[PDB]
Structure formats: C-alpha cells, structure tokens
C-alpha cells in the first residue's frame, strides 16, 4: 500500500537530518565529511530564456541557471520536519527555484547557504548587481 517517494541513496542523509536539532548544520557537516548531496530533485525542461530570478511561479531559468521545483530544494520539505521560520511556512514550496548551473549538483545545499536580494529578487553573489 502507498506510493514510494525516495530512492535508497538518500536513506542515510534523510534519516540523519530528520533526527538532528539543527538540520542545516547537520547537512553541512554531513557534506563536509565526504557525504553525498541529496539527489532525486525535480528539474524542469525549459527554454532557458527566463529573467533569471531566484524564486518565481514559472520556470524562469537563465542560460547560466537551471530551474527546479521548490519543494525538492528545501531541506525541511525533504526531511518532513519543521521549518525554522517563525510562521512555520515554506518560501520555496509552490514555486520554482533557479540554481546556478555550477551549483546545480546540490540544490538543497545551495538554498540553505544562500539568500535572495530583496530589491531585484536575485541570489546574492549569483546574478545580483546592486553595489
């Protein structure tokens, strides 16, 4: 009964981070020790002619970016745990997230380590230019 969601290659890192007090620190430490990134994300087939903004409602990937489904790029949605936001809601779920093609191998880690500039909606240090 029921439909499977995950692949065996994610069994360790998702079991680890679902038990930790600080799942972001746990995932960073798992990666630092030679662990492999969370796989099985939802990548979009798109024309790569979009505006290149970080989080959109449509796949808006630039030629230097790849577009993913948001719920697959959130560690807390991936481990089915509480979000550290005060409201408890997700900023990625229900949206499309554009990850640079150099960092597209680990989108879950990228969405943890980076942040979005407010005035342009770009990833800071990746396509953002306001200074």
């Amino acid at each position: 009964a029921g439909n499977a969601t995950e692949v065996p290659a994610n069994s360790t890192v998702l079991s680890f981070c679902a038990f930790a007090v600080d799942a972001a620190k746990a995932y960073k430490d798992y990666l630092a020790s030679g662990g492999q990134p969370i796989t099985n994300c939802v990548k979009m087939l798109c024309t790569h002619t979009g505006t290149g903004q970080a989080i959109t409602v449509t796949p808006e990937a630039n030629m230097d970016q790849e577009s993913f489904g948001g719920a697959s790029c959130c560690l807390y949605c991936r481990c089915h745990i509480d979000h550290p936001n005060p409201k408890g809601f997700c900023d990625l779920k229900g949206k499309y997230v554009q990850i640079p093609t150099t960092c597209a191998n680990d989108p879950v880690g990228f969405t943890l380590k980076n942040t979005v500039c407010t005035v342009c909606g770009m990833w800071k240090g990746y396509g953002c230019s306001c200074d």
């Binding site: 029921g2 969601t5 692949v7 007090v21 994300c41 979009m44 089915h80 979000h83 779920k93 229900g94």
Partner: protein, 512 residues
C-alpha cells in the same frame, strides 16, 4: 531504479503532486514527467487542500560524521554501560480509511515497568508544511492484539508523552549513569517511535553543571543532564543495541524462555522490554565474571568493601579463637590471602572454575551438597561469597541477598541479580532453603589488641577486657561504634551472615 519505503506516501489519492509541490521526482504526477524531466503545464492548477500521510518507517542510522556520536553501539561497549541499560518495546496501530501503509506508536513500554499510551499521531504533508497531527488508525487484526482495542480511547498527546518519558528516564538513571542505552529486539519500529521523542547532534554539556547533556528542551533551546532535566521534552544523544542481531532466531519469548522463568506476558510493551533486557543480561553476564572490565564508583562502594573486610576479619578471628578448628577451608577463594595470618590453623584454597594459573597452589572444587557433603567433615569451611545449593553444618557463610535491589544491585536473569561493585557479578536467586544447617550470626565485637588508651558504652556485646568493669574505655567505645556502623552498612547492602549452629560467644569470654 530501486526505491525505499522511507517517506512513503500513504495517502489514498490516486494522482501525484504538482512539480512545484512534489518533494521528489517520484512524487510528481505522470502528466508532467517527460524525458526524465518535468514540464510546467500552464493550465493545471496546484492542489491547496491535500493531506498526505508520510511513512516514518525505514530509517537508517549508519551515518559517519566527525562530531556526531553513533546511536548503535557494539555489545563490548554496551557491557561497559550495563548500568545505563533500559529495555524498550513499542506496540503499534495501522493507519486506516484516509491513508494505508504505515504504522503509528500506540503503547510505549520500558524495563522500568511503565506503559505510556499515545493517541495515533502522524506526519502529514500539506501544501504549506508538514503537520504533526492526529490521524485515523485501527488496532491490528488478530486475537493477540485484542487487548490493544481499549488503548485507542485513552491515549495522551505526544507533547505530554515525551515529558513523561524524560521524567521517568531521569528518575531512573540520575544515580546510575550519564547516558541511556536502549535495549531493543527489533529496531525498525523502535526507531520509528524514537522519531517522536529523540534528538541527535554533537556532544554537549548541561546548562547548570559540567555533566554530559542527555536531554534537550525546545521551549528554551537548552541541554541538561539527568539531574537538571525538569520540564525537558526530548532525549538528546541516546545509545541503543539490537539483541536480535546477536544471532537469535525465532521470537523474543521463545529465546527468553530458554533461560528465564520469571518474566512472561508477551505483547505488552513493558513486559517485552523486561524480557529483552533480561535476555541481553543473560547473553552478556551469566557466562562468567570478567575481571578485565572495571566500573566507576557511583556511591558507597568503598565503604561497603571496607565494612565487608572488617566484618570478615572479626568473625573469622572470633570463630577460630572460640572453637579452635584444626583446618579452615577457604572455599571459592583463588588467592591465598589469610584474613588472620597469626591464627593457629592450616589453610586450604579452592576455585569453583579453573583459573588461568596451572600451578598446584589451588585445587578444583565444584561444590554441591549431593557430592561434597562428607569431604570436609572436620574443621570449618569459610563460604565467603560462594553460592552453593546447600551448605554443610560447620560453615561460616556470607551470602548476598539478590532480593535487596539498590543502585549497586540491578535486576538479572531468572531471578538472580547483577551486582556491580568495581566488577559485574551475576548472582543466582536467593533461597532460604540453603541455610537449614546454620543460624543467623549475632552482632558482636571482640577485642584482642592491647587496651592502651565520649558517652560511656552500655552494650553487653562488646567482648573486651575493659567491659569487665565500670565502663568501656573510649578507644574501644568508639571502635565498637565504627564496627556497628560497618555491620549495619554491610547488612543493609544485602549481605546475610550465617554461622554453624554450635557457635556461641561465651567461649570468647574465657579468653581473657
């Protein structure tokens, strides 16, 4: 590609998820999948009211991170922390009528004897987050599980259940160890239940002292030990061992009944936990005492050892001076250390099992009353901490009472007890039928040292030269008090002293 049962979608909805809401590529619906990727179809809206139960079965805790301790320890390591062992068993209920395919914790039981019933609660993927909420569930079919039917109407919320778990663990373990080792029989559903009340991370320290952190509080983001865990709601960095991985076949009751007749009543979680811990204790300690493994001095162990030494010296000296046996058989003592060197008596030494020394210093003696009753007719036999079926009528015996439980004496297998005093000794169950030829040793003091020297002593059990007078001198008056304290400590610790029936103190009084 193969799939795993962890995080399985148990909901009864036939379709998949939107590409913006699916957590993995397997969750997205087949409308959007194309050439190994996904497509954003403009017309299709995303669901905003779905409630998809997620299966918490199939955790694998085989991570290897530098600062993070491992939950599953080896049995060589668990033997060193036997004082932290807590058996743990969970009963479950099946999700029904809105989701099918996962099991939820219903009754949690521990070797301490407690049972906690929780309402069936699960993790539900929602379009905003994951909601930890009560879900529909039913007890398993089968006669053996019918007693779980009343438990569906008396569960507690999980936020109360984990508070009670932390309180019980701290109350049991604050005077025994600095950690908890969970003794399990099948770690699958045990881990699935531990998801509800266990947190892991790097090693921490208590907020109010320098002890190891064993509990975590979400209401304050603080860590505490067993002494300071009031109001804490999670168990932080616990350890566990799976006994079934030690080569057992069959079920738990089948393997436990091979060695123990005390425990039973399967499919109740606390009883199964008691059976699991009993089986682990049997597999680790009933074989033989391992002198290579030492244990920390938790409390009063040195005082009890000194009290035992003083009591043994006094009673052996008094018996040898009063009755003047020709030969004393120090049965069960591999060492030739005489407790009274100057006694006019010859000494023989034996061992219950052969030691590593092959010299002719000691002789083998597997004592039983049916085979060795007449081998020691003359003299006296010193049965100090040696357990036999029945003692002869000419013995001085010290025997531990396994029914006196304490911090130094833990429950054992088949009615015995595991006594931990710098080493772990498993002692068989106490029976009063082994002392039918003896009598309880009266409390007394004897003095043979010279009487060269604040309330005057007024007790007639002080067999000394100065007692034949107006008052006992303050040297013996305080030494008698010290010996009385030692005797009371020793007999409160669980030690029972027996002597041959013809022992009398009056023969000592003629010595002066």
């Amino acid at each position: 590609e193969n799939v795993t049962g962890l995080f399985k979608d148990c909901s009864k909805v036939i379709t998949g998820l939107h590409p913006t809401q699916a957590p993995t590529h397997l969750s997205v619906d087949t409308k959007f999948k194309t050439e190994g990727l996904c497509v954003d179809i403009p017309g299709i809206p995303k669901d905003m009211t779905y409630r998809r139960l997620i299966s918490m079965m199939g955790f694998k805790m085989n991570y290897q991170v530098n600062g993070y301790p491992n939950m599953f320890i080896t049995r060589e390591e668990a033997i060193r922390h036997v004082r932290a062992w807590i058996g743990f068993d969970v009963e479950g209920c099946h999700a029904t009528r809105e989701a099918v395919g996962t099991n939820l914790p219903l009754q949690l039981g521990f070797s301490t004897g407690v049972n906690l019933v929780a309402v069936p609660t699960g993790y539900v993927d929602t379009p905003n987050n994951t909601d930890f909420s009560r879900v529909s569930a039913k007890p398993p079919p089968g006669d053996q599980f019918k007693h779980l039917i009343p438990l569906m109407y008396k569960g507690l919320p999980w936020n109360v259940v984990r508070i009670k778990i932390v309180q019980m663990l701290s109350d049991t373990l604050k005077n025994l160890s600095d950690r908890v080792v969970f003794v399990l029989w099948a770690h699958g559903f045990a881990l699935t239940s531990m998801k509800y009340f266990v947190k892991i991370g790097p090693e921490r320290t208590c907020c109010l002292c320098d002890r190891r952190a064993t509990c975590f509080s979400t209401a304050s983001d603080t860590y505490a030990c067993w002494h300071h865990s009031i109001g804490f709601d999670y168990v932080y960095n616990p350890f566990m061992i799976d006994v079934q991985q030690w080569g057992f076949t069959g079920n738990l009751q089948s393997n436990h009944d091979l060695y123990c007749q005390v425990h039973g009543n399967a499919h109740v979680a606390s009883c199964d936990a008691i059976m699991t811990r009993c089986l682990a204790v049997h597999e680790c300690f009933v074989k033989r005492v391992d002198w290579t493994i030492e244990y920390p001095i938790i409390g009063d162990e040195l005082k009890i050892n000194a009290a035992c030494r003083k009591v043994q010296h006094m009673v052996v000296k008094a018996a040898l001076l009063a009755d003047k046996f020709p030969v004393l058989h120090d049965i069960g003592n591999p060492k030739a250390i005489k407790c009274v060197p100057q006694a006019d008596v010859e000494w023989k030494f034996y061992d219950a099992q052969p030691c590593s020394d092959k010299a002719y210093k000691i002789e083998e003696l597997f004592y039983s009353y049916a085979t060795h009753s007449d081998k020691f007719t003359d003299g006296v036999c010193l049965f100090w901490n040696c357990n036999v079926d029945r003692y002869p009528a000419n013995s001085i015996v010290c025997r531990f009472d396994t029914r006196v439980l304490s911090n130094l004496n833990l429950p054992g297998c088949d009615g015995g007890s595991l006594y931990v005093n710098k080493h772990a000794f498993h002692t068989p169950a106490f029976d009063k039928s082994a002392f039918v030829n003896l009598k309880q040793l009266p409390f007394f003091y004897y003095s043979d040292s010279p009487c060269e020297s604040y309330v005057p002593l007024k007790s007639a059990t002080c067999i000394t030269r100065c007692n034949l007078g107006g008052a006992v001198c303050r040297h013996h008056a305080n030494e008698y008090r010290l010996y009385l304290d030692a005797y009371n400590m020793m007999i409160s610790a669980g030690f029972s002293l027996w002597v041959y029936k013809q022992f009398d103190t009056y023969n000592l009084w003629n010595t002066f």
